Design an enzyme around this catalytic site. Sequence first.
Site, mmCIF file in Angstrom:
data_model
loop_
_atom_site.group_PDB
_atom_site.id
_atom_site.type_symbol
_atom_site.label_atom_id
_atom_site.label_comp_id
_atom_site.label_asym_id
_atom_site.label_seq_id
_atom_site.Cartn_x
_atom_site.Cartn_y
_atom_site.Cartn_z
ATOM 1 N N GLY A 32 -12.457 5.657 -9.237
ATOM 2 C CA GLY A 32 -12.274 7.120 -9.184
ATOM 3 C C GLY A 32 -12.421 7.711 -10.573
ATOM 4 O O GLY A 32 -11.508 7.542 -11.400
ATOM 5 N N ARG A 88 -13.989 -4.081 -0.159
ATOM 6 C CA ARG A 88 -13.647 -5.521 -0.288
ATOM 7 C C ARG A 88 -14.513 -6.305 0.699
ATOM 8 O O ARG A 88 -13.960 -7.023 1.520
ATOM 9 C CB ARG A 88 -12.144 -5.679 -0.059
ATOM 10 C CG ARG A 88 -11.655 -7.115 -0.137
ATOM 11 C CD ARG A 88 -10.151 -7.140 -0.309
ATOM 12 N NE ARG A 88 -9.748 -6.724 -1.643
ATOM 13 C CZ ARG A 88 -8.527 -6.876 -2.137
ATOM 14 N NH1 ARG A 88 -7.577 -7.428 -1.398
ATOM 15 N NH2 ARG A 88 -8.270 -6.485 -3.374
ATOM 16 N N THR A 124 -11.862 9.319 0.449
ATOM 17 C CA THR A 124 -11.302 8.394 -0.574
ATOM 18 C C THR A 124 -12.393 7.538 -1.243
ATOM 19 O O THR A 124 -12.110 7.026 -2.346
ATOM 20 C CB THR A 124 -10.160 7.545 0.003
ATOM 21 O OG1 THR A 124 -10.714 6.719 1.023
ATOM 22 C CG2 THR A 124 -9.035 8.411 0.535
ATOM 23 N N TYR A 136 -21.629 -0.504 2.181
ATOM 24 C CA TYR A 136 -20.478 -0.288 1.260
ATOM 25 C C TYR A 136 -19.993 1.158 1.389
ATOM 26 O O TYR A 136 -20.812 2.069 1.228
ATOM 27 C CB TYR A 136 -20.835 -0.655 -0.185
ATOM 28 C CG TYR A 136 -19.825 -0.192 -1.209
ATOM 29 C CD1 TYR A 136 -18.584 -0.804 -1.346
ATOM 30 C CD2 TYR A 136 -20.086 0.916 -2.000
ATOM 31 C CE1 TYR A 136 -17.645 -0.342 -2.261
ATOM 32 C CE2 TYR A 136 -19.156 1.388 -2.915
ATOM 33 C CZ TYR A 136 -17.942 0.750 -3.064
ATOM 34 O OH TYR A 136 -17.056 1.267 -3.963
ATOM 35 N N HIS A 157 0.861 -1.209 0.000
ATOM 36 C CA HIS A 157 0.000 0.000 0.000
ATOM 37 C C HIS A 157 0.882 1.238 0.000
ATOM 38 O O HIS A 157 1.866 1.288 0.774
ATOM 39 C CB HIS A 157 -0.977 -0.003 1.181
ATOM 40 C CG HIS A 157 -2.051 -1.008 0.998
ATOM 41 N ND1 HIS A 157 -2.239 -2.068 1.855
ATOM 42 C CD2 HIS A 157 -2.959 -1.132 0.016
ATOM 43 C CE1 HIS A 157 -3.234 -2.808 1.401
ATOM 44 N NE2 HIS A 157 -3.702 -2.248 0.273
HETATM 45 MG MG LIG Z 1 -8.248 6.469 -11.948
#
Ligand SMILES: [Mg+2]
Length: 456
Positions: free
Chosen positions: A421, A405, A361, A385, A334
């Site tokens: 995104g 997840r 995020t 979610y 990460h």
């Molecule tokens: Mg993207």
Amino acid sequence: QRRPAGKKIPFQKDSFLQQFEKLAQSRKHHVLLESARGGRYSIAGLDPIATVKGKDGITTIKHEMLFKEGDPLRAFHSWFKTLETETNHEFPDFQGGAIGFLSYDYARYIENFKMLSLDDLETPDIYFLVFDDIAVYDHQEESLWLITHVNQETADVKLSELEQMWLTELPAVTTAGSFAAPFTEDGFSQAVEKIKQYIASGDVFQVNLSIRQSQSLSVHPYQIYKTLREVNPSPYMAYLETPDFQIICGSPELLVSKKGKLLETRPIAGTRSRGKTNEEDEALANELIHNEKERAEHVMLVDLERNDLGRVSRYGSVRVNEFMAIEKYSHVMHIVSNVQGELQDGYDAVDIIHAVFPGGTITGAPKVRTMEIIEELEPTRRGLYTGSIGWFGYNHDLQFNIVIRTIYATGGQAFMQSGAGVVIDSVPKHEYKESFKKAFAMQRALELSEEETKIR
Ligand SMILES: [Mg+2]
Ligand SMILES: N[C@@H](Cc1c[nH]c2ccccc12)C(=O)O
């Protein structure tokens, strides 16, 4: 004077998780928060003293049955405050209190939402199991903390009862709902085009757009959780069971923690398959860290988190103490930042949630407008979610993940949700493939678990 009392005993991780499973099969309501790969504590919630359920402006606490109209988390906290305790710095961060979730749709008490998306899952807005008696495994010290609440005489009798329950040998282990249509590839792709129009017109910079998949549930949810835990372990995993829904959470992301006055969020920039050597990991991490497009998306969301912590922190106290640091564990890497603030006096658990939830995020920048656009485009309510699972301490500490997840099991189905995104130059088809690939760990866990039950 209510206080925790605790005993620490030697214990192995395998024994803890195995004994948890056997104790849990007799509890209709239970929860496990598990550091499967890179955290310090696993928390076992077997025997609640109360259950808290908030939906659509009504909260019930069954402790007796109390109820209240309004903000469910405000209702929860005015009751929960009566059981408050002082920290005992000898015990783990979690030393008793409430474990459960804030649905994404708890955001409807934080901002004015329209009612456009379908509530087909009927997820509680908030749901907490409240514990005076807990078991917390310390992975670092290979010890099990047994914790109970008192007010010294009745203390050690309760702690010796808990110790006996965790050490006694036990045998080896042994309603179709109606749901809305998820996004089609075309539906998703047209919603991407709508987001790009909104970015071009200056409303938003970035929007997390998500798609729900479902399949028939043919295996016990705890079996699915054990498979996901073995194949894709993370530090913020959770299994929650009630008679009407089960949660299988494989999250690696922290929303917010409070340790005394210290507020912390840890936005993830991106995740990558580890290499085979350290030189390979350095180069594969650097490819994400050195990506100018990815870096600029991440800088936008770190800045969003600073303005979020800003709402409840002492002015000038909010700082980025780590920026695009490398977090490695199991087969995964990460790229993650760490934002900190000092909690300003007067602000409580509820004020902290209103500031930081839902996470930047899994919404976008700016957050309020982004949530209006999400509600206008997505056919279903997100429910759990991109909500948060975690704990509120009697001592006023807290720790919440972001629900990604994750499998939500209700009404004979397993629901899997993932997103992408969307930015000014997003290609609809590419963003659709991205979100579908993000459901692979859940699709595989379900497929492996089902095939495992066919072995005869
Ligand atoms: Mg993207
Ligand atoms: N990883 C956390 C404990 C934890 C596990 N799963 C979680 C889910 C939500 C919140 C916390 C957790 C810790 O070590 O402190």
